[PDB]
Design a protein around this ligand. Structure first.
Ligand code: FAD
Ligand code: BR
Ligand code: BR
Ligand code: BR
Ligand code: BR
Ligand code: BR
Ligand code: BR
Ligand code: BR
Ligand code: BR
Ligand code: BR
Ligand code: BR
Ligand code: BR
Ligand code: BR
Ligand code: BR
Ligand code: BR
Ligand code: BR
Ligand code: BR
Ligand code: BR
Ligand code: BR
Ligand code: BR
Ligand code: BR
Ligand code: BR
Ligand code: BR
Ligand code: BR
Ligand code: BR
Ligand code: BR
Ligand code: BR
Ligand code: BR
Ligand code: BR
Ligand code: BR
Ligand code: BR
Ligand code: BR
Ligand code: BR
Ligand code: BR
Ligand code: BR
Ligand code: BR
Ligand code: BR
Ligand code: BR
Ligand code: BR
Ligand code: BR
Ligand code: BR
Ligand code: BR
Ligand code: BR
Ligand code: BR
Ligand code: BR
Ligand code: BR
Ligand code: BR
Ligand code: BR
Ligand code: BR
Ligand code: BR
Ligand code: BR
Ligand code: BR
Ligand code: BR
Ligand code: BR
Ligand code: BR
Ligand code: BR
Ligand code: BR
Ligand code: BR
Ligand code: BR
Ligand code: BR
Ligand code: BR
Ligand code: BR
Ligand code: BR
Ligand code: BR
Ligand code: BR
Ligand code: BR
Ligand code: BR
Ligand code: BR
Ligand code: BR
Ligand code: NA
Ligand code: NA
Length: 490
């Protein structure tokens, strides 16, 4: 009653929910993306707060501090492990859900915008579009991903080779810290501002809004999706790709989707078919790309096209808060610095991707701008020398059929170990993977040593600076989860 008592004093009760409340279950599930985490055996928050004003957030944090109830913040709910709305083990926590704070204010001529953390990527992209056909912002591919978690974890998509990650294009934030104080860049100091942009969600306070710079794109971009089965010589072509793709011009990204003995080469080119074809002919003719393969469209139209395959449905695809896609999902990731021997590609395509419960593998090439940024200039370390990133995606759709796909994710990660990065085995923070390791808690504080185990995988040489920053802004580890930066102090 103590915490709840505090909340009602400053926050409109229509914005507060207890498990008792009749609307609680729908408020909880509304942005859950993973059916694994909605089943009733999952630990649920004691309370849910849905602020509409920043002062509501400040009040929630103050109350939380005063009555020692911890807060997990949720924006888009896409956390792979569900850590924005569940804990792994029993504990008492409130979720602050930001889905009602979703405004996007674009300043077209200044090429900047303020975006609320509760807005979804689709909404941010659309608002930029309404302002200018030739402005863009380099973030992820999924339109329902929340801005808050995405930017905090770094965030990258089809513009990553041109402009880098979403986080390194943030010029200001509005943040509520572990004491309910509201900061921006001017008032928070450098480590905190460095850490919050890429150092992972939750750990560095609740970001209310982000100011971004908007970047130029041509009025026309070109997409292609070219498939090659192993019969068509996939293994030979993908073997070339791993060396060529990272050093293609920054205007050209070619990623690979593979879900059987067949590679799909998905490309975004910031230019026309006219100029892409000779470039392909010159730099990667092994693909056999020709003008029939070109899809010219605006940058904004490329967003639903890349994720769905649709070309027609702009407002529907970018502005959607229905969420009927709640699969059971498991994810892992890897980084690759030196080329695979062609035999590994053969095993992947012919053997591993044809197993029971086998998943999907996505290959994003780096190099160019993302790899130009020094490794420590942001908390995101996977930069110079990276050929490509790998995501291992596993979907299933029935509650009892978990064992085989889980077993495949585990088995293929083991298989790949010799061929991917090591000491540490690097991983992408926004592809959250609890099997990389979790925090131990001693005297109600996350330990540095337990945090180090996964932390060096996500953040490499930047982990210690993140922990020191944490130590400065949240020494009592108020804002934490099972995989959040532990405070390092003396
Ligand atoms: C579901 C999904 C995820 C995707 C998809 N595609 C991606 C892509 O093309 N590029 C990427 O870089 N990442 C992609 N991902 C992963 C997402 O980027 C991550 O899953 C994001 O972390 C998701 O953000 P969000 O939807 O906001 O997730 P939440 O569960 O709300 O938060 C995650 C994490 O961060 C903390 N957090 C949330 N909100 C805040 C604020 N305002 N301030 C600080 N910290 C915050 C949460 O506590 C939690 O720990 C494609 C798809 C379909
Ligand atoms: Br109080
Ligand atoms: Br009210
Ligand atoms: Br209610
Ligand atoms: Br419930
Ligand atoms: Br709500
Ligand atoms: Br649900
Ligand atoms: Br998910
Ligand atoms: Br519970
Ligand atoms: Br406000
Ligand atoms: Br207060
Ligand atoms: Br107390
Ligand atoms: Br506490
Ligand atoms: Br567990
Ligand atoms: Br779990
Ligand atoms: Br735990
Ligand atoms: Br201006
Ligand atoms: Br602005
Ligand atoms: Br308009
Ligand atoms: Br995304
Ligand atoms: Br979607
Ligand atoms: Br800046
Ligand atoms: Br504000
Ligand atoms: Br304040
Ligand atoms: Br401020
Ligand atoms: Br400043
Ligand atoms: Br100031
Ligand atoms: Br600081
Ligand atoms: Br994260
Ligand atoms: Br700027
Ligand atoms: Br341009
Ligand atoms: Br053009
Ligand atoms: Br196509
Ligand atoms: Br094809
Ligand atoms: Br082969
Ligand atoms: Br070839
Ligand atoms: Br190479
Ligand atoms: Br080249
Ligand atoms: Br270029
Ligand atoms: Br042409
Ligand atoms: Br040509
Ligand atoms: Br050739
Ligand atoms: Br066309
Ligand atoms: Br178009
Ligand atoms: Br066009
Ligand atoms: Br349209
Ligand atoms: Br909708
Ligand atoms: Br490697
Ligand atoms: Br290397
Ligand atoms: Br098998
Ligand atoms: Br460098
Ligand atoms: Br720095
Ligand atoms: Br290197
Ligand atoms: Br490089
Ligand atoms: Br299934
Ligand atoms: Br099974
Ligand atoms: Br399951
Ligand atoms: Br099995
Ligand atoms: Br090894
Ligand atoms: Br190591
Ligand atoms: Br490791
Ligand atoms: Br693992
Ligand atoms: Br513990
Ligand atoms: Br204690
Ligand atoms: Br404890
Ligand atoms: Br240590
Ligand atoms: Br390291
Ligand atoms: Br590093
Ligand atoms: Br470190
Ligand atoms: Na290494
Ligand atoms: Na997982």
């Amino acid at each position: 009653e103590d915490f709840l008592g505090c909340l009602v004093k400053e926050i409109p009760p229509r914005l507060l929910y207890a498990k008792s409340s009749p609307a609680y279950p729908s408020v909880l599930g509304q942005t859950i993306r993973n059916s694994r985490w909605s089943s009733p055996d999952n630990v649920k928050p004691l309370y849910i707060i849905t602020p509409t004003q920043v002062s509501h957030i400040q009040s929630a944090v103050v109350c939380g501090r005063r009555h020692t109830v911890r807060i997990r913040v949720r924006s888009g709910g896409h956390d792979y492990e569900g850590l924005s709305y569940r804990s792994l083990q029993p504990e008492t926590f409130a979720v602050v859900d930001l889905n009602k704070m979703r405004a996007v204010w674009v300043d077209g001529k200044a090429r900047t915008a303020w975006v609320d953390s509760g807005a979804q990527l689709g909404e941010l992209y659309y608002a930029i579009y309404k302002a200018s056909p030739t402005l863009a912002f380099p973030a992820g591919v999924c339109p329902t991903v929340g801005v808050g978690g995405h930017f905090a974890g770094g965030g990258f998509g089809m513009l990553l080779r041109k402009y880098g990650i979403a986080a390194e294009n943030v010029i200001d934030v509005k943040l509520v810290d572990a004491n309910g104080k509201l900061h921006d860049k001017k008032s928070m100091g450098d480590d905190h501002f460095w850490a919050v942009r890429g150092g992972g969600g939750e750990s560095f306070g609740i970001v209310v809004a982000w100011q971004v710079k908007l970047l130029p794109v041509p009025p026309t971009v070109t997409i292609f999706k070219i498939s090659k089965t192993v019969s068509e010589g996939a293994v030979d072509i993908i073997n070339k790709w791993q060396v060529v793709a990272p050093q293609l011009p920054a205007d050209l990204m070619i990623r690979i989707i593979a879900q059987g003995p067949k590679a799909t080469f998905e490309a975004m080119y910031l230019g026309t078919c006219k100029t892409l074809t000779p470039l392909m002919s010159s730099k990667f003719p092994e693909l056999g790309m020709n003008p029939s393969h070109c899809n010219e469209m605006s940058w904004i139209q490329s967003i639903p096209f890349v994720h769905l395959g649709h070309r027609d449905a702009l407002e529907d695809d970018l502005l959607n808060r229905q969420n009927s896609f709640k699969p059971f999902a498991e994810y892992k990731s890897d980084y690759v610095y030196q080329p695979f021997p062609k035999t590994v590609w053969e095993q992947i395509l012919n053997t591993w991707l044809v197993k029971p419960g086998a998943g999907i593998m996505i290959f994003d090439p780096y190099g160019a701008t993302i790899s130009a940024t020094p490794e420590s200039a942001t908390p995101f370390p996977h930069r110079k020398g990276v050929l490509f990133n790998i995501q291992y995606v596993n979907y299933w759709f029935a509650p009892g059929a978990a064992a085989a796909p889980l077993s495949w994710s585990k088995d293929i990660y083991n298989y790949m170990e010799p061929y991917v990065s090591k000491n540490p085995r690097q991983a992408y923070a926004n592809y959250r993977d609890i099997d990389l390791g979790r925090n131990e808690v001693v005297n109600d504080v996350s330990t540095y040593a337990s945090g180090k185990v996964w932390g060096q995988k996500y953040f490499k040489g930047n982990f210690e600076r993140l922990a020191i920053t944490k130590g400065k802004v949240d020494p009592t580890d108020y804002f934490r989860n099972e995989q959040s930066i532990p405070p390092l102090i003396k």
